[PDB]
């Protein structure tokens, strides 16, 4: 299913922002 390769990249990467942002945000600022 095409929704197996086009789901683990466009979707995950989206919510991954709230995570990554928070990650480096801990270092000093964001």
Coordinates of C-alpha atoms in Angstrom, one line a residue:
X1 CA 0.0 0.0 0.0
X2 CA 1.3 3.4 -1.0
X3 CA 0.1 4.7 2.4
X4 CA 2.9 2.7 4.0
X5 CA 5.8 4.6 2.5
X6 CA 4.1 8.0 2.4
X7 CA 3.1 7.8 6.0
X8 CA 6.3 7.1 7.9
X9 CA 8.0 10.2 6.3
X10 CA 5.4 13.1 5.8
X11 CA 3.4 12.3 9.0
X12 CA 6.1 11.3 11.5
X13 CA 8.4 14.2 10.4
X14 CA 5.5 16.6 11.1
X15 CA 5.1 15.7 14.8
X16 CA 8.8 15.2 15.0
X17 CA 9.1 19.0 15.0
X18 CA 7.5 19.3 18.5
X19 CA 10.0 16.8 19.7
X20 CA 13.2 18.0 18.0
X21 CA 12.4 21.6 18.9
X22 CA 12.1 20.6 22.5
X23 CA 15.3 18.6 22.3
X24 CA 17.7 21.4 21.3
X25 CA 15.5 23.8 23.2
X26 CA 16.9 22.2 26.4
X27 CA 20.5 23.0 25.3
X28 CA 20.1 26.8 25.6
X29 CA 17.1 28.3 23.8
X30 CA 14.9 27.9 20.7

